[PDB]
Design a protein around this ligand. Sequence first.
Ligand SMILES: [Cl-]
Ligand SMILES: [Cl-]
Ligand SMILES: [Zn+2]
Ligand SMILES: [Zn+2]
Lengths: 21, 21, 21, 21, 21, 21, 28, 27, 28, 28, 27, 27
Amino acid sequence: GIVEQCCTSICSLYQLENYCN
Amino acid sequence: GIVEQCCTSICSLYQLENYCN
Amino acid sequence: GIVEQCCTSICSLYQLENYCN
Amino acid sequence: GIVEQCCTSICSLYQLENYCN
Amino acid sequence: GIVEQCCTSICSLYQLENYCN
Amino acid sequence: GIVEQCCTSICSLYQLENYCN
Amino acid sequence: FVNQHLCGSHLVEALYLVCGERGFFYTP
Amino acid sequence: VNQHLCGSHLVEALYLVCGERGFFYTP
Amino acid sequence: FVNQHLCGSHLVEALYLVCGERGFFYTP
Amino acid sequence: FVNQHLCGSHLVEALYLVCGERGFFYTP
Amino acid sequence: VNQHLCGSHLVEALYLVCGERGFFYTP
Amino acid sequence: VNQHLCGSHLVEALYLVCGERGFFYTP
Ligand SMILES: [Cl-]
Ligand SMILES: [Cl-]
Ligand SMILES: [Zn+2]
Ligand SMILES: [Zn+2]
């Protein structure tokens, strides 16, 4: 998930945006 | 300025991008 | 809502727990 | 202390509460 | 107090240093 | 730079101050 | 408006800590 | 601890990028 | 009330950085 | 005055995330 | 640096969980 | 990620220590 995807390596704004709603 | 624009109104990330560089 | 309840009054951690899950 | 107890591994709310007052 | 002094006026880091220890 | 100087090891207030202006 | 934007930021912060493994939704 | 701390930056970043929409978060 | 709750959060933050090895008490 | 000091803190935070490798200047 | 950064999250978390009582912190 | 997170604390610390002057930041 986001912790898996964005904590081992940076997420762009667009990548982070997959977790909106 | 940024304080005058974004502390009175909410500024989105696209507005804020104009103060980068 | 949470903004309406906790930005007008201070909300403790027990109040806030009701918006978890 | 808290840095010893809560930075090598997560502290619950109750664990953190030992450091109140 | 610190809230009464630094939430009404802006407090610099030198003002704030007086509430350390 | 600051990331090089202040993320591998703590910077004092005075050290951080080199990056003001 | 701003008042509440900034408060929202602290609220998510606090919900993060409080909710634990529950997690949470936030909408403005 | 390192990922609890990252999570906390993540929600803050979500808060801003998501806007009106809001977001969901679970660890 | 909220104004000051949120300011308190920044204040602890700033006292953290400023006080260093001194540390600090905070009460609301 | 305080209102804006505290908002500035969130603004730098947001500029940090948004600007990426650009970076930014901030002045009050 | 890793523990200075953790400390900063710690005080914030203390600020919220302790409430009226407040707290004490030393590194 | 560890340095992106440190950066975020850095700017906050800069914001406070620099005051009227402000600061510049680049990663
Ligand atoms: Cl605030
Ligand atoms: Cl961190
Ligand atoms: Zn704030
Ligand atoms: Zn952090």
